[PDB]
């Protein structure tokens, strides 16, 4: 099968230098020219560089030149990505793509039909955080009909990502786990939420289970009634 | 640069029914015109390139057309594999400058749903810290549009709150949202009514849901 695969992509703080690497496999790489795409959280694809076949041409978003610098080793199979004076802005998904076929030099687009899997590249200050677990009480200001709602405030970690559970998976009908959004402290907070039954908030333990494999952070929170 | 303009951003469809996705160019772009689809957590994938060439593999349902400034995407017969957001991306002059547009999203038709408001008052865990949230919960509606408006007693609250929305329900096709206002201790002892006031289409007037700090 045809295939592209990126790595390197990691945590950088403001101001450094990251470098990409793309490799291929099962066709003939040294004929086609080569893209990086990358995509902010939230927001959509933006071409970032091209390199020809033959290294002679290589061009980039005005966003990104000056600071980055694309390459290519046709032995190796490989596609490069040098990221310099790293900003927020920078944090994103990264992919490599492929681009025209140039068999004896004559090239033919075809469109960017090949793509790899990509690599994140995130920009901040911050330092692996695990996160502080806090309880969404159910009250009657989060009692309406026959239906209590209940949470879990998982605040103030990095980097991404968490997993919830509610007691221990027994528990997943109604059940909405939140994207994480950025704060301004650069640290990622979520929320996890459930409704259950209102009449069952005095009898029904709720407990949410946080798990933050990158820092070392098991928790089990119990969801009490206010 | 190029600008690709792709209006509208949403869509709501129901699978069978023919939908038809939008290109504009700032400039002339001849048929150097390509459709991608993408789907969350995954790369993009190449559905047309040449403005109406089918990629390898690509179902029969997916057609491109159009030239110069204006281009369509049509699928004939949506299926519900196809809910996904779709890219139109230039390629025209030499020097390459590959511009994308913005996206269409295609979500899932279904009847209005009212949001469930609920709110969460912040724990005493969390007060000993020296921050304070409160959590807005709007569950279950349909469809996307809603606003949540934060008082802070009685007086409009800006730039203190962050919000995150759920994709469609699995089952039911409704959102649910979370509104997140965030406060310093001092500030949050210093108040003592907090609001959330939701408005959406599946509700006849706005739905505040309240507290006074310290039950």
């Known amino acids: 099968e045809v295939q592209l695969v990126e790595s390197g992509g990691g945590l950088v703080k403001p101001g450094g230098s990251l470098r990409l690497s793309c490799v291929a496999s099962?066709?003939?790489?040294?004929?086609?020219?080569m893209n990086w795409v990358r995509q902010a959280p939230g927001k959509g694809l933006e071409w970032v560089s091209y390199?020809?076949?033959?290294?002679?041409?290589?061009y980039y978003a005005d966003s990104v030149k000056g600071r980055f610098s694309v390459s290519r080793d046709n032995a190796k199979n490989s596609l490069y990505l040098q990221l310099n004076g790293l900003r927020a802005e920078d944090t994103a998904v990264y992919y490599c793509?492929?681009?025209?076929?140039?068999?004896?030099?004559?090239?033919?687009?075809?469109?960017?039909?090949?793509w790899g899997q990509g690599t994140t590249v995130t920009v901040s200050a911050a330092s692996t955080k695990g996160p502080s677990v806090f309880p969404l009480a159910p009250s009657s200001k989060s009692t309406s009909g026959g239906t209590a709602a209940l949470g879990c405030l998982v605040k103030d970690y990095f980097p991404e990502p968490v997993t919830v559970s509610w007691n221990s998976g027994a528990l997943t009908s109604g059940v909405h786990t939140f994207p994480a959004v950025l704060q301004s402290s650069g640290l990622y907070s979520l929320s996890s939420v459930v409704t259950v039954p209102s009449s069952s908030l005095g009898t029904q333990t709720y407990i949410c289970n946080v798990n933050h494999k990158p820092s070392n952070t098991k928790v089990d929170k119990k969801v009490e009634p206010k | 640069e190029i600008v690709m303009t792709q209006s509208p951003a949403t869509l709501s469809v129901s699978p069978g029914e023919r939908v038809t996705l939008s290109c504009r160019a700032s400039?002339?772009?001849?048929?150097?015109l390509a459709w991608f689809q993408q789907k969350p957590g995954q790369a993009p994938r190449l559905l047309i390139y040449?403005?109406?060439i089918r990629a390898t593999g690509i179902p029969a349902r997916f057609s491109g057309s159009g030239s110069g400034t204006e281009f369509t995407l049509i699928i004939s017969s949506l299926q519900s594999e196809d809910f996904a957001v779709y890219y139109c991306?230039?390629?025209?002059?030499?020097?390459?400058?590959?511009?994308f547009g913005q996206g269409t999203k295609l979500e899932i038709k279904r009847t209005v749903a009212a949001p469930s408001v609920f709110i969460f008052p912040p724990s005493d865990e969390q007060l000993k810290s020296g921050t304070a949230s409160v959590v807005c919960l709007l569950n279950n509606f349909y469809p996307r549009e809603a606003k949540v408006q934060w008082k802070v007693d009685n007086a409009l609250q800006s730039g203190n709150s962050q919000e995150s929305v759920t994709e469609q329900d699995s089952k039911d096709s409704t959102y649910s949202l979370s509104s997140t206002l965030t406060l310093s201790k001092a500030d949050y002892e210093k108040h003592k009514v907090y609001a959330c006031e939701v408005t959406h289409q599946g509700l006849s007037s706005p739905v505040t849901k309240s507290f006074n700090r310290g039950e």
């Open positions: 793509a492929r681009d025209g076929y140039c068999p004896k030099g004559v090239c033919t687009y075809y469109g960017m039909d090949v």
């Open positions: 099962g066709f003939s790489f040294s004929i086609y020219s």
């Open positions: 390199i020809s076949s033959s290294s002679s041409y290589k």
């Open positions: 400039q002339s772009v001849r048929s150097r």
């Open positions: 040449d403005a109406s």
């Open positions: 991306q230039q390629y025209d002059n030499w020097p390459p400058a590959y511009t």
